[PDB]
Design a protein around this ligand. Structure first.
Ligand code: MWP
Length: 126
């Protein structure tokens, strides 16, 4: 069901949270080789999450589930904010700009905590 596809999507999202926090520890410790690998892993996890979210939104639309579509439109919008900040974080790592990396990192943590009530609302609406 779309609801079980959203649970699969949620888990992938939580995997990115898990890796992201491990990455943050590596960054603070100066283990740049680890950070590079974690950033690669996170790109794969975000790409997969984005795709699952789009399939869920498209299915909710085909089902006529207006409330779920409204919530998923808000949610996917926020996901594009994370994407843009994540992209700038990766660029800051490439450029050796630790100040920008720190900034973007705290931004992404706010994105995830800011949207978790909406994430839970979606589960109940699908
Ligand atoms: N693409 C992408 C990258 C990072 C983050 C997200 C999306 S999010 O908005 O799910 C939270 C962090």
């Amino acid at each position: 069901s779309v609801k079980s596809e959203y649970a699969e999507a949620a888990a992938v999202g939580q995997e990115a949270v898990a890796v992201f926090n491990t990455m943050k520890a590596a960054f603070q410790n100066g283990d740049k080789e680890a950070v590079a690998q974690y950033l690669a892993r996170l790109a794969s996890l975000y790409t997969r999450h984005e795709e699952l979210l789009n399939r869920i939104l498209e299915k909710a639309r085909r089902e006529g589930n207006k409330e779920a579509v409204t919530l998923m439109n808000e949610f996917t919008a926020t996901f594009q904010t994370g994407k843009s900040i994540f992209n700038a974080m990766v660029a800051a790592f490439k450029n050796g700009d630790d100040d920008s990396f720190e900034s973007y990192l705290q931004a992404l943590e706010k994105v995830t905590a800011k949207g978790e009530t909406l994430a839970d609302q979606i589960a109940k609406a699908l």
